[PDB]
Symmetry: C2
């Protein structure tokens, strides 16, 4: 068990009062991986750190670009050109200097997924946009019963009150999730069971897509909320599993 | 009237692709006030900045405290003891150096609300927690037809998906909103109309409250702020539309 220090309780006393003391230790002992530190994942990383999660792995090899500014928490003038994962790690150490943060400066691929998932995470939050690796990550977590939550496309959306969680097989107005389902079947033989489910939790929105005005655009209000609903769903699952034990 | 630089178009290309060029220009010309830079308002200030809003005022007098860490974007070790509004202003300038950020290092009170509120804001986001000033700010904006969105209670809640916007008269499960309508009536004679509405937009959640000083979580308090900002932008855009 990670030891909760007096400074930890000052930082996260509001966490303890919301979720209880048992959950505070559960979160301090957790190890959560965020794959893709972008429009969804950067805000997922922020939320985990601010809810007293004791260890966080960040996996991404992209750098902060000026064009990230609309929707990524790490996109500031002074960060531009630095590695997203490294920049987010430094911000997490500012939120909670006792959080153990690991940076994997790499992309997940069908060939390295086993080694990066081999670590035994409490939860994986998949926030990547490229469909091939996303399918491979999902296929691997599902087969190995690794707790995972994924996200459909967060672009082309303006209403954060329509964001919610469903089985991946049952999303709508999400072309990314549809391509994902195709690739899961075609490359990994992962298909719907009899009850019509893939057994994979997906954050999506019922909102009708807003097509490019002036690729799809995006807004913090929506993309960040994707990440926050992914974190809330993961924490809730973790707590349910602990109580069940 | 703000001339959108190319640097601005590089920052907010994605904004333009989502809301359109006309909206982008409307946001660059807007001036939005955020009152209370806490678990709700700090994320609202952030969303405002990252959506290309061209002028932002922040009103708060409190300092960043370690206990803020669970739910406020400016709560970081090196910021502790600095004025929240100034820390947030500095961050906004790092998001968009061309943004015009004004810090009011004061609390809104029933005696200074007209002086601060009547600067001609495009929109006011009220994210204050104290009931009496909050009633006063709502009553003033509503009497003066200042576009306002207010936020109810964000603490004691774990489910960001239950957050919504409705007329302040129709909120449920929110004691802060209930106390506000009471105070509005008693101290300002602000009361429901014919249609049952008070004519005030309120961000609230239908979730039943979790009693341990409620706790709070970023995933919820931030989403209150994000939903306030999306609502304000929708209303401004709809008003622009209808020329
Ligand atoms: N295979 C991958 N592994 C890890 N991160 C990825 C991978 N593919 C894409 N990403 C990242 O996922 C993030 C997607 O965010 P966005 O551009 O905001 O949708 C970006 O930061 C990408 O660099
Ligand atoms: N009358 C007021 N005028 C402006 N800001 C206020 C007022 N009362 C409270 N606040 C701020 O509202 C914020 C509430 O945040 P929280 O404590 O997270 O609800 C804090 O940063 C307070 O300092």
């Amino acid at each position: 068990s990670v030891v909760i220090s007096d400074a930890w309780r000052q930082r996260f006393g509001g966490t303890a009062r919301l979720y209880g003391e048992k959950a505070l230790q559960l979160f301090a002992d957790a190890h959560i991986c965020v794959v893709g530190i972008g429009g969804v994942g950067s805000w997922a990383a922020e939320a985990l750190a601010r809810t007293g999660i004791g260890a966080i792995t960040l996996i991404d090899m992209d750098d902060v670009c000026v064009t990230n500014t609309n929707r990524q928490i790490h996109a500031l003038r002074d960060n531009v050109g630095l590695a997203k994962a490294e920049v987010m790690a430094e911000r997490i150490r500012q939120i909670n200097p006792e959080c153990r943060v690991t940076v994997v400066d790499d992309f997940v691929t069908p060939d390295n997924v086993a080694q990066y998932m081999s670590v035994g995470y409490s939860y994986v939050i998949d926030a990547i946009d490229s469909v091939r690796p996303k399918a491979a990550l999902i296929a691997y977590c599902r087969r190995n019963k690794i707790p995972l939550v994924t996200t459909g496309g967060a672009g082309g959306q303006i209403d954060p009150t329509q964001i919610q969680v469903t089985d991946l097989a049952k999303t709508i107005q999400d072309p990314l999730a549809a391509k994902l389902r195709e690739r899961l079947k075609s490359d990994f033989g992962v298909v719907k069971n009899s009850k019509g489910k893939l057994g994979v939790d997906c954050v999506f929105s019922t909102e009708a897509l807003v097509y490019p005005q002036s690729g799809f655009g995006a807004a913090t209000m929506v993309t960040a909320t994707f990440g926050f609903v992914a974190v809330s769903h993961a924490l809730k699952k973790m707590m349910a599993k602990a109580a069940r034990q």
